Amino acid sequence: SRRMLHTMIRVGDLDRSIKFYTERLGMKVLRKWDVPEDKYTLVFLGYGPEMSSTVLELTYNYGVTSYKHDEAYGHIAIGVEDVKELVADMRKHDVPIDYEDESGFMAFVVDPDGYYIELLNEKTMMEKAEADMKEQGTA
Amino acid sequence: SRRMLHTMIRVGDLDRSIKFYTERLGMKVLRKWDVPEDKYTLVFLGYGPEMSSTVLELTYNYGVTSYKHDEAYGHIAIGVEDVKELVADMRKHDVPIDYEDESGFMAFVVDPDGYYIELLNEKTMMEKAEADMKEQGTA
Ligand code: NA
Ligand code: NI
Ligand code: NI
Full 3-state SS string of chain A? CCEEEEEEEECCCHHHHHHHHHHHCCCEEEEEEEEHHHCEEEEEEECCCCCCCCEEEEEEECCCCCCCCCCCEEEEEEEECCHHHHHHHHHHCCCCEEEECCCCCEEEEECCCCCEEEEEEHHHHHHHHHHHHHHHCCC
- Alpha-carbon distance of B37 to B109, in angstroms, equals 35
SS3 B104: coil
Q: Domains of chain B, with CATH numbers?
A: 1-139 (3.10.180.10)
Query: Between the CA of residue A105 and those of A80, A95, B41, B53, B58, what are the distances in Å?
Result: 10, 19, 20, 20, 20
Resolution of this PDB entry, in A?
Answer: 2.0
Residue A23 labelled as part of a binding site: no
DSSP state, residue B102: S
- Alpha-carbon distance of A58 to A67, in angstroms, equals 13
Q: Considering only CA atoms, which of B132, B127, B103, B110 is closest in space to residue B25?
A: B110
| Beta-carbon contacts of residue A38 (< 8 Å; ≥ 6 apart) | none
Q: Are B11 and B17 in contact (CB under 8 A)?
A: yes
- Alpha-carbon distance of B116 to A111, in angstroms, equals 22
End-to-end CA distance of chain B: 19
Q: Are B32 and B41 in contact (CB under 8 A)?
A: yes
The catalytic position among A50, A100, A118, A122 is A118
In the sheet that holds A28-35, the strands lie side by side as A28-35, A40-46, A55-61, A3-10, B73-80, B116-121, B106-110, B97-100
- Alpha-carbon distance of B18 to B30, in angstroms, equals 11
Amino acid at B32: K
HSE (CB half, 13 Å, CA atoms) of B6? 25
- Which experiment gave this structure? X-ray
Shortest Cα distance from B43 to chain A (angstroms)? Answer: 12
Residue A118 annotated among the catalytic residues of the structure? yes
- Alpha-carbon distance of A86 to A26, in angstroms, equals 10
DSSP-H helix ranges across chain B:
14-19, 83-92, 122-136
**Which residue out of A1, A50, A128, A136 would a mutagenesis test of the B interface target, given it has the greatest number of B Cβ atoms within 10 Å?**
A50
Closest listed ligand to the CA of A125:
2
Tell me which chain A residues have a C-beta less than 8 angstroms from the C-beta of B130: 49, 51
DSSP state, residue B115: -
Query: Between the CA of residue B106 and those of A38, B3, B9, what are the distances in Å?
Result: 17, 26, 22
HSE (CB half, 13 Å, CA atoms) of B21? 30
